[PDB]
């Protein structure tokens, strides 16, 4: 999970 | 917005989508392309190919269980785009470039047509 | 094989299921969540969730244009997670992350499940 | 485009  | 992305959601929805084509789930067209049928799911297609966005689109002909492409279509030509659409994969060959180029143009999959005109630029 | 990969063709299949969703183009299926409706692709649901997987490899269920669920279901949570399976992107809040967990749970998404206890874990 |  990543911040777009 | 605050989303959060999980990077390795639409490669693993494509791997699915392909298992559920090589199973023969929820196939809802064949594609005929003269001696051979090619089962796919509709949406997949459009999702892939400017053509099949505008004849699935259209009223009458998204209601259509058979779909007949232009006798001029190699069959194998056909065969690697479609096993791209569900794989990001393109099976590119000195043997098979002319016919996947070609193919690419009809089915309108404009980022497949510019790899294989760079790569017969590359052999010129 | 010798193939070569395009990079995004993943991420564009998902982006145009997406807009195929958002002009119910080709949708096959309503999931009724309480008092609310919500139109998807099956195939899309069964690629993201466990739980849609094994409702439409069913044999009678495969061919049911209406699924009801279970009414302890959120319909926002249900919202949430279907809009994650179109786009890779999950609203997680703290207003919702009990809701959205929940969902996660009933519909067998791992992946979501999993980002959702640590994000629990770590408040606690 | 690149090799997978
Ligand atoms: O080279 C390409 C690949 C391609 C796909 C599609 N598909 C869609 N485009 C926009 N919205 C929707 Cl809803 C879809 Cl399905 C249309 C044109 C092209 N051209
Ligand atoms: O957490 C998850 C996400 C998920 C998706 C699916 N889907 C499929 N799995 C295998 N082959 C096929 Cl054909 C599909 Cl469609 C099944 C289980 C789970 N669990
Ligand atoms: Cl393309
Ligand atoms: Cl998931």
Same mark, same amino acid.
């Given at each position: 999970?990543?911040?777009? | 917005?605050?989303?959060?992305?999980?990077? &390795?959601?639409?490669?693993?929805? !494509?791997?699915?989508?392909? &298992?559920? &084509?090589?199973?023969? +789930? !929820?196939?809802?067209?064949? @594609?005929?392309?003269?001696?051979?049928?090619?089962?796919?799911?509709?949406?997949? !297609?459009?999702?892939?190919?400017?053509?099949?966005?505008? +004849?699935?689109?259209?009223?009458?002909?998204?209601?259509?269980?058979? @779909?007949?492409?232009?006798?001029?279509?190699?069959?194998?030509?056909?065969? @690697?785009? !479609?096993?791209?659409?569900?794989?990001?994969?393109?099976?590119? &060959?000195?043997?098979? +470039?002319?016919?996947?180029?070609?193919?690419?143009?009809?089915?309108?999959?404009?980022?497949?047509?510019?790899?294989?005109?760079?790569? +017969?630029?590359?052999?010129?």
């Amino acid at each position: 999970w990543v911040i777009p | 917005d605050s989303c959060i992305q999980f990077t &390795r959601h639409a490669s693993d929805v !494509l791997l699915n989508l392909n &298992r559920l &084509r090589s199973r023969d +789930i !929820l196939t809802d067209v064949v @594609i005929v392309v003269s001696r051979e049928q090619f089962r796919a799911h509709k949406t997949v !297609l459009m999702a892939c190919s400017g053509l099949f966005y505008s +004849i699935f689109t259209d009223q009458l002909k998204c209601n259509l269980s058979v @779909i007949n492409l232009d006798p001029e279509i190699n069959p194998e030509g056909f065969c @690697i785009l !479609l096993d791209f659409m569900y794989t990001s994969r393109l099976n590119l &060959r000195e043997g098979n +470039i002319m016919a996947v180029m070609a193919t690419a143009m009809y089915l309108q999959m404009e980022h497949v047509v510019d790899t294989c005109r760079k790569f +017969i630029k590359a052999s010129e």
